[PDB]
């Protein structure tokens, strides 16, 4: 089974800014697509396998990625994401 150690930006899920737009960031699963997954982030939960946020404040951001298991849901420990400057568009 999955464990938390397995559970890594870069190995289980990645964490990316928009290359246009800083203050959009993609939120994916690296996991097989079978896999049920789980993500708590600023907005709060989604289990969908791709999430974007559009953040508009200047702030240090967490996103924690969880995976189903036989036992249940297995989280990693928190990856943290930075917004520079403030998208008025995003408010």
Known sequence: ?????????????????????????????????SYQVCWQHPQGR????????QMPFEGKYEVTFGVQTRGGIVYGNPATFTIDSFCADFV
């Open 46 to 53: 989604s289990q969908e396998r791709e999430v974007t946020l």
């Open 1 to 33: 089974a999955v464990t938390v150690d397995d559970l890594v930006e870069g190995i289980a899920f990645s964490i990316t800014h928009d290359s246009e737009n800083p203050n959009i960031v993609y939120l994916k699963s690296l996991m097989p697509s």
